[PDB]
């Protein structure tokens, strides 16, 4: 019934740094992914209370969303780009796991993921 605490976006014990690849990922999020027409269901944690999804956090034990990722980038939470890419993969996979093929939300995730992977394939360095 209740929502879990959302994923942390800062941790005083976790080392932080800025890298040009992490800056590129933030640029991709802000310029391209955040304002995509299909972005809005991914811009914040799934609110199982509002949506009355008592099973969501029984099925999804590693939640992730683009609002969390964006804040992590803005707070320099990550040590490397791979951590951030893994968070994106987790977000997309969670959507595929909870929902079912043919759902419009799955089509939205697939389109966002296709665009994200295009941007990954253009990562600098």
């Amino acid at each position: 019934s209740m929502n879990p605490p959302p994923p942390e976006t800062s941790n005083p014990n976790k080392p932080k740094r800025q890298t040009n690849q992490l800056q590129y990922l933030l640029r991709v999020v802000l310029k391209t992914l955040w304002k995509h027409q299909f972005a809005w269901p991914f811009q914040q944690p799934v609110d199982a209370v509002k949506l009355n999804l008592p099973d969501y956090y029984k099925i999804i034990k590693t939640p992730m969303d683009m609002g969390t990722i964006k804040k992590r980038l803005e707070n320099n939470y990550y040590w490397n780009a791979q951590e951030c890419i893994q968070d994106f993969n987790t977000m997309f996979t969670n959507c595929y796991i909870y929902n079912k093929p043919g759902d419009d939300i799955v089509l939205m995730a697939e389109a966002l993921e296709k665009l994200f992977l295009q941007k990954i394939n253009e990562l600098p360095t």
Binding site: P41, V46, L51, L53, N99, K100, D103, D104, I105
Partner: peptide
């Protein structure tokens, strides 16, 4: 599905 269409 999550009922997102019902939100609005």
């Amino acid at each position: 599905a999550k009922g997102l269409l019902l939100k609005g």
